[PDB]
Amino acid sequence: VDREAMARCIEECLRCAQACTACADACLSEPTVADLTKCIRTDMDCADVCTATAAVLSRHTGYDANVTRAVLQACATVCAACGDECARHAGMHEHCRVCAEACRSCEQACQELLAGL
């Protein structure tokens, strides 16, 4: 994969983690928090996996590409799941709309890197 595409994917992961954390926090402050618990949980998983993925991608050398691939697959899966749950709430909550978009961009960047590896 391109070193520039790798840097772009790292940036997407770092930004997606932050977007998810912001959304989880916003959901926690909603009066309807009891209806947003899966959103919050999936936000937390996505942040944790994105954070790990950003770090792993920063050290990618092409040797043991199996590690990089496995981490990207996990990140794409969690970003997709988080985006799906945020998108369910996006009509009611702008924070969920914003987070869904960040999750989709990270998902796509991870898939692009997976295809290029």
- Positions touching a second copy (CB under 8 A) are 7, 10-11, 14-15, 17-18, 21-22, 24-26, 28-29, 31, 33-34, 37-42, 44-45, 47-49, 51-52, 54-56, 58-64, 66-67, 70-71, 73-74, 77-78, 81, 85
By the rule CB under 5 A, 39 interacts with Cu ion: yes
Q: Which residues, in sequence order, are CB contacts of 49 under 8 Å at separation 6+?
A: 74, 75, 78, 79
Q: For residues 61 and 115, which CB has a smaller minimum distance to a second copy in the complex?
A: 61
Is 73 within 8 Å of 10 (Cβ atoms)? no
Pick the closest to residue 44 from 101, 3, 103 (CA basis): 103
Write phi, then psi, for 36 (nearest 5 degrees): -120, 15
User: What is the distance between the alpha carbons of residues 103 and 13, in angstroms, rounded to a whole number?
Assistant: 9
23 interacts with Cu ion by CB under 5 A: yes
Question: Which residue numbers belong to the known binding site for Cu(+)?
Answer: 9, 13, 16, 20, 23, 27, 39, 43, 46, 50, 75, 79, 82, 86, 89, 93, 95-96, 99, 103, 106, 110
